[PDB]
Amino acid sequence: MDEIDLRILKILQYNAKYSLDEIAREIRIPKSTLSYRIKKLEKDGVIKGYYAYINPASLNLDYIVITSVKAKYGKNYHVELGNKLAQIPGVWGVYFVLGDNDFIVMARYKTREEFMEKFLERVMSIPEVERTSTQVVVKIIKESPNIVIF
Amino acid sequence: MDEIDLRILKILQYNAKYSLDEIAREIRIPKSTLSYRIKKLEKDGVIKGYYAYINPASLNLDYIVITSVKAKYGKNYHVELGNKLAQIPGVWGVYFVLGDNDFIVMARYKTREEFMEKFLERVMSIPEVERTSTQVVVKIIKESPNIVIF
Amino acid sequence: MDEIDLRILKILQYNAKYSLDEIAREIRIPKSTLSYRIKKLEKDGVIKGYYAYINPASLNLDYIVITSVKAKYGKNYHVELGNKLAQIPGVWGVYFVLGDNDFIVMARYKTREEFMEKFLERVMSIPEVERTSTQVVVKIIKESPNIVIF
Amino acid sequence: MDEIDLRILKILQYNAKYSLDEIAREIRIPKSTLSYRIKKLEKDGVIKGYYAYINPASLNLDYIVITSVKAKYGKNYHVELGNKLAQIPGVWGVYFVLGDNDFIVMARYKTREEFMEKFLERVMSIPEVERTSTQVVVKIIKESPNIVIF
Amino acid sequence: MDEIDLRILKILQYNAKYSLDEIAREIRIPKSTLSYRIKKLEKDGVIKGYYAYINPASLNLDYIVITSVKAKYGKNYHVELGNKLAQIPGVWGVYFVLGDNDFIVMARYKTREEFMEKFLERVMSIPEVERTSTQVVVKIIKESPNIVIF
Amino acid sequence: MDEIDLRILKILQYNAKYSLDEIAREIRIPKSTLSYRIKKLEKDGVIKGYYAYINPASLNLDYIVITSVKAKYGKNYHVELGNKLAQIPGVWGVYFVLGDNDFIVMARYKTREEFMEKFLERVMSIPEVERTSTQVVVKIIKESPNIVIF
Amino acid sequence: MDEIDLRILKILQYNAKYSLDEIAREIRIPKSTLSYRIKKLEKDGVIKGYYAYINPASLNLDYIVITSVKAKYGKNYHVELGNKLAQIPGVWGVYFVLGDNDFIVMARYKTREEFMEKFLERVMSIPEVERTSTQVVVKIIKESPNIVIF
Amino acid sequence: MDEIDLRILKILQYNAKYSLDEIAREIRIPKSTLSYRIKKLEKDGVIKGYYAYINPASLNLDYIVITSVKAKYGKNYHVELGNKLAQIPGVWGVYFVLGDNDFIVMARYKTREEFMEKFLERVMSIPEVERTSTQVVVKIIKESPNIVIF
C-alpha cells in the first residue's frame, strides 16, 4: 500500500460508516478510485472487517480483569494452555509475553460472581497452571485498540 | 434495551456492514423496526461508533508491548501520570489496576527503535514514575476487543 | 430496610445492650415500633446475632498472625484447601483474594509454640499447599470488625 | 480469671443475649454468682462491650479489600501513617506486621466507586506512602473475629 | 538467677579465662561465693560450655554465605529438610523463619570450589527443596554471637 | 600454623577449659610444647579470646529476628548505615551481602515489645533506610558459630 | 555479503590466524579472491577487528559478577547512568533490557576485595541508582561471544 | 608470567594482527624474545586462540536476549539442564549464579520468530525447568568481552 491507502485507513479506523463521497472529498481522489483502493485493502487482508464499537458499560460489564498465568514446562503444556485460556467466555485477549514469560489474559464480566464462575473457577481447575495473578481494573484511562495509525 | 437489542448487537459486534435486510431476516423483525432500534442504540450511547478492523501486521506493527508503570504517591501524581501515558503515540490502552496498584499500558510500534524513541525514552523522562516493567508480546493468541457478547 | 433501620443498626453495632427506652429516645420513634423493627431485622438475617467483645489480650492472645497461602492448581484443590484452613483452631478469618490469587488467613494464638503446634505444623503437612508467608502482627492500630456503618 | 470465667466467655462470644437463667443452668452455678462474675469481667476490661453482628451483605458491602501499605522511613512517618489509615471511613482493621514490615489494612465498601473515592484516592494523596497493594476479596470462607475461645 | 549472676555472665560472655580473684574483685563478692554461683549456672544449663573464639580468616574461611531454602509441603518434608541442612559440613546455623516461611542457613567455606562441592551440590540433589537463594557475604560489619547481655 | 595447631584448635573450639594434660595426651605432644603453641596462636590473633557459651533461653531471649535492610544510594549512606545497625542493643550480627545487595542483621530480644522499642522503632527513624524485612525465627535447628573446624 | 562471505566469517570467528592458503582450500576459491573479500568485510565494518582470546583464569579473574542496576526516573538519569557503569574498570558488558527495565552489567575481578573497591563501592556512591542486585557467577558453562554463526 | 607478558597481552586483547616489529618497538624487547614469549603464552593456555570480531548487526542479529532459567531440584537436574542450554543454537553464554541461584543464558537471534523457534520453544519443552524470565536487550551500551586487562 501507499501513502494514499494510509490516509484512507486513518479515516476508516475511526469511522467505518463515512460515505465514499465524503472520504473522496477529504483525501482528494475520485470516488471510484477510492472504492477500488478500499476493495483491494479488504482483499489483501489489510482491512479484516468492520465492527460496531459497543460501550461495555451499556452491557453492565463492570468487572474488568487482566490476569497473568504461568504454565508448567514440558510436553506441549504452554501452547495448549494458551488455547484453553482463549476459549473462555469473556476473554478477549490472550498474549504470551517475555519478561514474566507467561500469558496475559484480558477479560470482561458483569460481576464478581460471573468472573468467578466463568473464569477463575475454570482456570483453577487446569492442572498445568503454575500460578495466576488477577489485576482488577478500577479505571480505564484509555481503550482504543481500533487506533493503529496515530 | 431488551433481548432483541442484544441479538442485534451480537451481530453488529462482528459485522457492521451487514445490510438491514439480512439482519432483519436473521432476527425476524421488520426492517423499519430494526432501523429504529439501531438508531436508538446509537442515540443512547450503546453503539459508540463503527470502526474498520485493520490488521496490525499489515502496518508492520511488529513490536507489541504491555508495560506496568508505578507512580509516586502524593499530590495528584497518579491521575496526572495516567493522562501523560495516554497521550503517547502508539499507546492504545491505559488501565489502573488493583493488585499491583499501578498502570498497565498497551502499545504497538513498528520496531524496537520506534518503541524506544516514542515510548520508553518519553516515560524514562517523567520524574513521578517510580518503576516500569515492559513485557514484550511475542505471540498474540487472541485479540478481539470488539467481542462484548459471547 | 430504610433510613430508620440504619440509625438503629448504627447504635446496635456499638452497644447491643442499650435498652429499648434509650434507643427509642435517641431515634424518636415508639418503643413498640423499635422492638418491631429490630425483630424484623433479626428475622430477615440483617442482624445475625449478638456477641460479647472479649479483649484478646485478656486471654493472653499475644501471637497474632496473617498468613498468605497459595494452593496447587487442578482438581478441586483450591476449594478444599480453603475449608481445611478454616477448620484450624485459632483461625478466625479465611479469605480468597485477587492480586496474589491466594488465601489470606487471620489467626490468634497465646504463644509462638501454640502457633507452631496448632497452625504452622498443620499447614506444613498439607500437600496441596504450594507456598505460605506468615506476617507477624506486632501492632494492632485498629480492629473493629463490628463497625459496618461509619 | 478462672476456668469458670472461661466457660462463661465461651458462651458470651457466641450469644450475648442468653439469659442468666440459661447460662447458670449450662455452667452449673448460682445465677447471682454468674451475674457477679460477668460484672467483674466487664469491670476488669475482659469483656469490652456487646455488639450486634450485622450481615455486611445486607448493607450491600460488596467491595471487600485487604491492602498492604509501605511507609517512608525517617522522622515519625510510620506511626503517623498508621493513624491516618485508621481514620479512613470503611477501614475496620489496621495492623503493622513483620515479614513485609508494613501495614495491612482491612476495609469494606459498597462499590468500586466508593472504594476509589473514600479509600484509594485518599491514600494515593499521602506523600509518605511508598507502595500499596490492594487484594480484592472475592470469597469470604470464614470471618468470625468474635471467636476467641475455640 | 539474680542480678549478681547477670553481672557474672556479663563478664564471662567476653572473657572465660578471667581468674576468680579478678571477677570477685570486680563484682564485690567472696571468691568462694563466686565459684559456687558459677558452678550452679553450669549445673542449671545457663552456661552451656566455654569455647575458644577462633578467627575465621586465620583458617582462610573467605567464602561466607547465607542461604534461604524453601521446602516442599506435605508429609514431614519440612522437619526432615532442616535436619539434612544442619548435617552439612561448614553449616553452623540453621533457622526456620516466618515471613518467607523457610530456612535460613549460615555457612563458611575456604573457597567457592569448597562451597560448591560441600554445600551447593549437596543441596541441589535434595528433591524436597523447592527453591534456594544464596547471599554471598562480602563484609562482616559485626559478628559477636557470644554477646547475650548488652 | 600446621596440622598440629589444627588439632589443638579443633578441641579448643568445643572446650576451652580442657587442661593442658588432657589435650597433651589426646594429641600426643609435650605439655610444654602445647602451652607454647597455644600462646603463639593467641599472639598471632588466631585465637581471639575465650567466651562462655550462655543459653539464650536462660536469659528469656525468646524473640529472635533476622532483618534485611536496604540502604539509599549515594554519599556514604551504605557504610554509615551498617555502623548504625551494629550499635543497636540486641544486635549481634551485621553482614552486607550480594544477591539482595543489602544488610542482614541478626538480633535477639526478650519480647516483641523489647524488639519494637530497641530495634524496629530505632531503624524506622533512620531516613537513609529504603526498606526492611524482618524474619521471625520460630525454630533454631542449629546455632554453633564456634565451630570453625568440621 | 553473500553465502561465501558467511563461510569465510564462520572460519574467522574461530581462528583468525588461519593462512589464506588453508581457507582458500577449505572454501574453494582463489586465494586472491579470498584476500579481496576479507579486505572488503573489514572495510565495510563487518569484521571489526581481531583479538587474542585470553583465558581469564590465567589472569586470576576469579570473582565474576552479573549485576542488575535500576535507575531513577526523570531528567537524563538513565542514559547518564549507563555511561557511568561502562567506564568502571573490570566492566566489559552493559546492557539495558526490558522486563526488569534496567541495566545488566557484566564484570570480572581477581578477588572480592577488588570487586568491592573497583565496582560496588563506586556504584554505591551514585545517587541516581535506585537498586542493585549482584549475582555471583560460580560456574561458567559456556562463554563464547565470538561465535556469531552457528 | 611477568609484567612483560601482561604488556604483550594488553596489546593482543585489542589487536591480534599487530606485527612482531610493531609490538617489539612498543614494549622495548627483541622481536625474537617477543615471539618466544607469545609462543609460550599459547603453549601454557594463557592465549586460547585468536578470533575475528564480527559485528552482530552485520549479521542482522537484532533480537538479543538474556534469560534466567530456574531448575528443578534433585537427581542431576541442575547440571544436566546447564548442558542442554549450552547446546542451543544462538546461545553463547551460560552461567550458574548465586543470589537467584539459577542459570543466566545469553543468546542472539535475527528475529523474534527465530528466537521463539530456536530458543524459547526448545526451553519450554524441557520438564526440569521450573521458571524462565527473558530480558530483551534494547541497547548495548558496551560489549567488549575481549578486554581482560584494563
Ligand SMILES: NC(=O)CC[C@H](N)C(=O)O
Ligand atoms: N469523484 C467522485 O467523487 C465521483 C465521480 C468520479 N468520476 C468517480 O468516479 O469517482
Ligand SMILES: NC(=O)CC[C@H](N)C(=O)O
Ligand atoms: N420487513 C422488511 O424487511 C421490510 C419491509 C417492512 N414492512 C419494514 O418496513 O421493515
Ligand SMILES: NC(=O)CC[C@H](N)C(=O)O
Ligand atoms: N414510646 C415508648 O418508648 C413507649 C410507649 C409507646 N406507646 C410504645 O409502645 O412504644
Ligand SMILES: NC(=O)CC[C@H](N)C(=O)O
Ligand atoms: N440459681 C439460680 O439460677 C437463681 C437462684 C440462686 N439462689 C441465685 O441467686 O443465683
Ligand SMILES: NC(=O)CC[C@H](N)C(=O)O
Ligand atoms: N574473697 C576472696 O576473693 C577469697 C577469700 C574469701 N574468704 C572466699 O572464700 O571467697
Ligand SMILES: NC(=O)CC[C@H](N)C(=O)O
Ligand atoms: N608431657 C607432659 O604432658 C608434661 C611433661 C613434659 N616434659 C612437658 O614439659 O610437656
Ligand SMILES: NC(=O)CC[C@H](N)C(=O)O
Ligand atoms: N588459488 C590460490 O590459492 C592462489 C593462486 C590463485 N591464482 C590466486 O591468486 O588466488
Ligand SMILES: NC(=O)CC[C@H](N)C(=O)O
Ligand atoms: N629486535 C628486533 O625487533 C629484531 C632483531 C632482534 N635481534 C631480534 O631477534 O628480535
Ligand SMILES: [Mg+2]
Ligand atoms: Mg474495531
Ligand SMILES: [Mg+2]
Ligand atoms: Mg461483633
Ligand SMILES: [Mg+2]
Ligand atoms: Mg562462644
Ligand SMILES: [Mg+2]
Ligand atoms: Mg575475542
